[PDB]
Design an enzyme around this catalytic site. Structure first.
Site, PDB file in Angstrom:
ATOM      1  N   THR A  24       0.824  -1.199   0.000  1.00  0.00           N
ATOM      2  CA  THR A  24       0.000   0.000   0.000  1.00  0.00           C
ATOM      3  C   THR A  24       0.875   1.273   0.000  1.00  0.00           C
ATOM      4  O   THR A  24       0.641   2.212  -0.753  1.00  0.00           O
ATOM      5  CB  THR A  24      -0.887   0.071   1.242  1.00  0.00           C
ATOM      6  OG1 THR A  24      -0.095  -0.243   2.406  1.00  0.00           O
ATOM      7  CG2 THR A  24      -2.126  -0.906   1.123  1.00  0.00           C
ATOM      8  N   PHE A  33      -8.123   4.767   4.228  1.00  0.00           N
ATOM      9  CA  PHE A  33      -7.655   3.955   5.360  1.00  0.00           C
ATOM     10  C   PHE A  33      -8.774   3.211   6.047  1.00  0.00           C
ATOM     11  O   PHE A  33      -8.644   2.803   7.197  1.00  0.00           O
ATOM     12  CB  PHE A  33      -6.925   4.842   6.368  1.00  0.00           C
ATOM     13  CG  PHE A  33      -5.650   5.426   5.820  1.00  0.00           C
ATOM     14  CD1 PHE A  33      -4.524   4.625   5.676  1.00  0.00           C
ATOM     15  CD2 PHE A  33      -5.587   6.775   5.456  1.00  0.00           C
ATOM     16  CE1 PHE A  33      -3.318   5.125   5.157  1.00  0.00           C
ATOM     17  CE2 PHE A  33      -4.379   7.315   4.933  1.00  0.00           C
ATOM     18  CZ  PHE A  33      -3.235   6.474   4.784  1.00  0.00           C
ATOM     19  N   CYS A  59      -7.244   1.519   9.233  1.00  0.00           N
ATOM     20  CA  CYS A  59      -5.814   1.232   9.217  1.00  0.00           C
ATOM     21  C   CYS A  59      -5.117   1.588  10.541  1.00  0.00           C
ATOM     22  O   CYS A  59      -5.069   2.749  10.933  1.00  0.00           O
ATOM     23  CB  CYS A  59      -5.163   2.037   8.085  1.00  0.00           C
ATOM     24  SG  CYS A  59      -3.423   1.652   7.879  1.00  0.00           S
TER      25      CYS A  59
HETATM   26  C1  HEM Z   1      -0.861   4.140   2.162  1.00  0.00           C
HETATM   27  C2  HEM Z   1      -0.676   3.072   2.950  1.00  0.00           C
HETATM   28  C3  HEM Z   1      -1.817   2.227   3.543  1.00  0.00           C
HETATM   29  C4  HEM Z   1      -3.107   2.113   3.186  1.00  0.00           C
HETATM   30  C5  HEM Z   1      -3.908   2.805   2.062  1.00  0.00           C
HETATM   31  C6  HEM Z   1      -3.744   1.171   4.071  1.00  0.00           C
HETATM   32  C7  HEM Z   1      -5.081   0.806   4.033  1.00  0.00           C
HETATM   33  C8  HEM Z   1      -5.730   0.050   4.971  1.00  0.00           C
HETATM   34  C9  HEM Z   1      -7.146  -0.240   4.981  1.00  0.00           C
HETATM   35  C10 HEM Z   1      -8.162   0.269   3.952  1.00  0.00           C
HETATM   36  C11 HEM Z   1      -7.424  -1.004   6.054  1.00  0.00           C
HETATM   37  C12 HEM Z   1      -8.865  -1.540   6.391  1.00  0.00           C
HETATM   38  C13 HEM Z   1      -8.937  -2.992   5.883  1.00  0.00           C
HETATM   39  C14 HEM Z   1     -10.312  -3.627   6.055  1.00  0.00           C
HETATM   40  O1  HEM Z   1     -11.280  -2.937   6.454  1.00  0.00           O
HETATM   41  O2  HEM Z   1     -10.432  -4.858   5.810  1.00  0.00           O
HETATM   42  C15 HEM Z   1      -6.173  -1.239   6.755  1.00  0.00           C
HETATM   43  C16 HEM Z   1      -5.982  -1.995   7.895  1.00  0.00           C
HETATM   44  C17 HEM Z   1      -4.798  -2.203   8.549  1.00  0.00           C
HETATM   45  N1  HEM Z   1      -3.538  -1.685   8.211  1.00  0.00           N
HETATM   46 FE1  HEM Z   1      -3.228  -0.340   6.703  1.00  0.00          FE
HETATM   47  N2  HEM Z   1      -2.808   0.699   4.959  1.00  0.00           N
HETATM   48  C18 HEM Z   1      -1.608   1.355   4.687  1.00  0.00           C
HETATM   49  C19 HEM Z   1      -0.406   1.179   5.353  1.00  0.00           C
HETATM   50  C20 HEM Z   1      -0.197   0.427   6.475  1.00  0.00           C
HETATM   51  C21 HEM Z   1       1.044   0.280   7.215  1.00  0.00           C
HETATM   52  C22 HEM Z   1       2.398   0.958   6.842  1.00  0.00           C
HETATM   53  C23 HEM Z   1       0.800  -0.572   8.233  1.00  0.00           C
HETATM   54  C24 HEM Z   1       1.740  -1.103   9.343  1.00  0.00           C
HETATM   55  C25 HEM Z   1       2.941  -0.563   9.576  1.00  0.00           C
HETATM   56  C26 HEM Z   1      -0.584  -0.977   8.170  1.00  0.00           C
HETATM   57  C27 HEM Z   1      -1.219  -1.821   9.065  1.00  0.00           C
HETATM   58  C28 HEM Z   1      -2.566  -2.113   9.106  1.00  0.00           C
HETATM   59  C29 HEM Z   1      -3.205  -2.934  10.132  1.00  0.00           C
HETATM   60  C30 HEM Z   1      -2.543  -3.615  11.348  1.00  0.00           C
HETATM   61  C31 HEM Z   1      -4.671  -2.998   9.770  1.00  0.00           C
HETATM   62  C32 HEM Z   1      -5.783  -3.724  10.561  1.00  0.00           C
HETATM   63  C33 HEM Z   1      -6.146  -2.815  11.752  1.00  0.00           C
HETATM   64  C34 HEM Z   1      -7.333  -3.409  12.517  1.00  0.00           C
HETATM   65  O3  HEM Z   1      -8.260  -3.930  11.885  1.00  0.00           O
HETATM   66  O4  HEM Z   1      -7.346  -3.398  13.760  1.00  0.00           O
HETATM   67  N3  HEM Z   1      -1.178  -0.342   7.092  1.00  0.00           N
HETATM   68  N4  HEM Z   1      -5.142  -0.584   6.071  1.00  0.00           N
END
Ligand code: HEM
EC number: 1.14.14.1
Length: 453
Positions: free
Chosen positions: A266, A391, A398
């Site tokens: 991402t 996000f 996120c």
């Molecule tokens: C531009 C960069 C990023 C975008 C667009 C993005 C996007 C997202 C999105 C849309 C979700 C929701 C997923 C769902 O509803 O099924 C999510 C969840 C998550 N992301 Fe990101 N992400 C990015 C970068 C990162 C980074 C760098 C990390 C860790 C260092 C990360 C860790 C996580 C985690 C742990 C979740 C689950 C959180 C939870 O449900 O408790 N993401 N991300």
């Protein structure tokens, strides 16, 4: 009201529409035709795809809908386990890890990761400075080296040393191939056919590669008692504010794997799209470059200075508006309900938020939704609620958002401070899809401004 549905294919229903290199872009094309909501059936599965802010604002009401584990997330769970990304909201390890990891991903925590982010950023910049006049940059390829290494270092103080090699570290190779297999399974109507036995063998050995490396580092860290500035030290020491227990070793391993798979692609996709829009819009590149030169006045950027890169921040959000790099997330109705006053849903029904379409909703953004205009984001108080969701949503949004934005802002800032960029091939956007989206074949030339690093 009755909802539209794209072409069906007998017993495969709509499944063949996504038998393509670019299924998300197929879905956008279908949305453009069918409107704010359409039904999509696979054998034994039904999902409703949402594209208007009108309907998605209701879908984001957590009293009515909760995060669903889509088929893709269920497949990713075979190696991401009960880490934050692939857990149900009501799973005990979701609640426990959520509580424990929250202050590790807060804005304050970013002060602690900043030095390691700068470490890898300096490597990327030095690499570009060392290119000969004849050479060009493979943009997504380098952005991916950068984000993996950064997550490796901040995650568990491990150096994949991606800028020292042609062939990635074997962990990375296995992870990329596991993700690929997980996405590929989405199209498999007959998962257990002998034709896939080899895919299975390879999948299991890739999972094994990932678990062996991470388990070993955790075990050694526990044995040695060593402490560091990484997420691994936080999780080894952190007690849940609710239950008073730390995460167990197996879940720690899954969180580490999860940071890598949720964050690396991402974020690198985001840097890649942003650089693309900047070279396609020279006025904006010049404004961003001026801010970077104005703000990053020291041979190496401080945490405070990155926070001052307001316009770079707008550039990043406008790239996320147009090409949100995790472009879809899934929800289930907690009870029978009626969506938008028109579309009855039963308990358990699945919704998919198609973020790129939401971000193109004219009733929200105006006549010019395809234009790259960072100025939309000058005043974040202006954006309607639930209009901008790169996000995700609510308590399942996120967890990496601050990390991703701080890395992307630091890095893009440093790039614009140190180089002039030329779109020397007049590159034609071609968007590759894995679990995420990125420009494919995006190349540029960077001329150094020869500023000391
Ligand atoms: C531009 C960069 C990023 C975008 C667009 C993005 C996007 C997202 C999105 C849309 C979700 C929701 C997923 C769902 O509803 O099924 C999510 C969840 C998550 N992301 Fe990101 N992400 C990015 C970068 C990162 C980074 C760098 C990390 C860790 C260092 C990360 C860790 C996580 C985690 C742990 C979740 C689950 C959180 C939870 O449900 O408790 N993401 N991300």
């Amino acid at each position: 009201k009755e909802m539209p549905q794209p072409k069906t294919f007998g017993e495969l229903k709509n499944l063949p529409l996504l038998n393509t290199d670019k299924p998300v872009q197929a879905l956008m094309k279908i949305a453009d035709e069918l409107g704010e909501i359409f039904k999509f059936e696979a054998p034994g599965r039904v999902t409703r795809y949402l594209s208007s802010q009108r309907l998605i604002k209701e879908a984001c009401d957590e009293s009515r809908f909760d995060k669903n584990l889509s088929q893709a997330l269920k497949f990713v769970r075979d190696f991401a386990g009960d880490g934050l990304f692939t857990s149900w909201t009501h799973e005990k390890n979701w609640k426990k890890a959520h509580n424990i990891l929250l202050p590790s991903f807060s804005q304050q925590a970013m002060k602690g990761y900043h030095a390691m982010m700068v470490d890898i950023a300096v490597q990327l910049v030095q690499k570009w400075e060392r290119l000969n006049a004849d050479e060009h940059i493979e943009v997504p390829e380098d952005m991916t080296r950068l984000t993996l290494d950064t997550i490796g270092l901040c995650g568990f103080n491990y150096r994949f040393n991606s800028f020292y090699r042609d062939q990635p570290h074997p962990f990375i190779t296995s992870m990329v191939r596991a993700l690929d297999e997980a996405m590929n399974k989405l199209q498999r109507a007959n998962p257990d056919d002998p034709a896939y036995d080899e895919n299975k063998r390879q999948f299991q050995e890739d999972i094994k590669v990932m678990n062996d490396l991470v388990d070993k580092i955790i075990a050694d860290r526990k044995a040695s008692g060593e402490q560091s500035d990484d997420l691994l030290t936080h999780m080894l020491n952190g007690k849940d504010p609710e239950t008073g227990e730390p995460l167990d070793d197996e879940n720690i391993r899954y969180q580490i794997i999860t940071f890598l798979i949720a964050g690396h692609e991402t974020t690198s996709g985001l840097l890649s799209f942003a650089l693309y829009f900047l070279v396609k819009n020279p006025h904006v590149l010049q404004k961003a470059a001026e801010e970077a030169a104005r703000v990053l006045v020291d041979p190496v950027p401080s945490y405070k200075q990155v926070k001052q890169l307001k316009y770079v921040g707008m550039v990043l959000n406008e790239a996320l508006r147009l090409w949100p790099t995790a472009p879809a997330f899934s929800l289930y109705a907690k009870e029978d309900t009626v969506l938008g006053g028109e579309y009855p849903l039963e308990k358990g029904d699945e919704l998919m938020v198609l973020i790129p379409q939401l971000h193109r909703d004219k009733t929200i953004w105006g006549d010019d939704v395809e234009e790259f205009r960072p100025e939309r984001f000058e005043n974040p108080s202006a954006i309607p609620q639930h209009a901008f969701k790169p996000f995700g949503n609510g308590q399942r949004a996120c967890e990496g958002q601050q990390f991703a934005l701080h890395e992307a802002t630091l890095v893009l800032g440093m790039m614009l401070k140190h180089f002039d960029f030329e779109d020397h091939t007049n590159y034609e956007l071609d968007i590759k899809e894995t679990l995420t989206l990125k420009p494919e074949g995006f190349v540029v030339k960077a001329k150094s401004k020869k500023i000391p690093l």
